[PDB]
Amino acid sequence: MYGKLNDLLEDLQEVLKNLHKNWHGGKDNLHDVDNHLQNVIEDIHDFMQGGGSGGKLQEMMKEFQQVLDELNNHLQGGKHTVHHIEQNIKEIFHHLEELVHR
Helix, strand or coil: CCCCCHHHHHHHHHHHHHHHCCCCCCCCCCCHHHHHHHHHHHHHCCCHHHHCCCCCHHHCHHHHHHHHHHHCCCCCCCCHHHHHHHHHHCCCHHHHHHHHHH
């Protein structure tokens, strides 16, 4: 049953696109950061179906948030970006940890 939670996860990954233009410089350095995120989306997507559920969202969660670390720690005068990505991502763990812990 658990799987549609992904529909909410998508926003996060797409929210990063903005982060790239306001994390510090461009996408070049973010590519290595959002890579963690994007790579996590699958770890989470493949999780929704019990491919490591109730256990990966704890250590993997920080993996999607860490992306906003390099970013949030270098808001290159573009808080408005991350603000939208942090409110989304930081609010992602909710619909995330809320799924397995529902």
